[PDB]
């Protein structure tokens, strides 16, 4: 996109990743490091072998690695963490269910209680269901649930 429209005056870092749901009132992170010349800026490459364990960075390969674009740091006013299958906090590099908390969280589904029990388990910490890791303090999504 950037290389094909560059001659028409679009600057290279205009792109702005953002991950937002309806329940959270839209985006909750923003990535600013997406340059035309630099395809790795804001792009994390890892070995497919380490997806279950601590991700191991890797080189650009056609079969054996995976690239994840960094969405960025939580927005001013909220906090994000990730949890394991037992709802415990995870280490820096391990993949987990993304859980988000802040003043932007909805009141709750209208006329639907058991859905509330799943989403904000305890202390209003909302279960997005999206699986992703939180590296360097800047969230980086890996994949949504069941998608």
């Amino acid at each position: 996109f950037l290389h094909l429209l560059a001659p028409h005056g679009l600057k290279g870092d205009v792109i702005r990743p953002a991950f937002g749901m309806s329940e959270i009132s839209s985006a909750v992170v923003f990535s600013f490091a997406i340059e035309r010349g630099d395809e790795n800026s804001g792009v994390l490459t890892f070995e497919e072998t380490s997806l279950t364990e601590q991700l191991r960075p890797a080189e650009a390969r056609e079969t054996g690695t995976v690239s994840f674009t960094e969405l960025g740091k939580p927005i001013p006013g909220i906090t994000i963490r990730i949890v394991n299958h037992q709802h415990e906090l995870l280490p820096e590099d391990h993949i987990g269910r993304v859980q988000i908390k802040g003043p932007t969280t909805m009141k709750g589904y209208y006329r639907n209680d058991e859905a509330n029990q799943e989403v904000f388990q305890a202390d209003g910490w909302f279960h997005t269901g999206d699986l992703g890791f939180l590296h360097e303090g800047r969230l980086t999504l890996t994949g949504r649930e069941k998608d």
Binding site: K73, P74, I75, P76, G77, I78, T79, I80, R81, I82, L89, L90, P91, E92, D93, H94, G96, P103, F133, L134, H135, G137, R138, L139
Partner: protein
């Protein structure tokens, strides 16, 4: 004298009356020195996040409705 021993053991197995038939044979084998137990040499004491905040937000500035 080796099989003579084997025989005197069978007669010893008959000393016990509660047993009424049995079988016994011997093997010669080389020994491998017994290991140590770590407790015998070593001392006791030797034998023994992803949560990001985006920065505070000033929600009380501007329109509340």
């Amino acid at each position: 004298s080796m099989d003579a021993i084997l025989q005197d053991v069978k007669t010893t197995i008959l000393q016990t009356n509660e047993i009424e038939r049995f079988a016994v044979f011997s093997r010669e084998k080389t020994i491998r020195p017994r290991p140590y137990h770590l407790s015998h040499l070593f001392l006791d004491k030797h034998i023994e996040p992803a949560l990001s905040y985006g920065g505070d937000l000033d929600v009380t500035q501007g329109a509340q409705t």
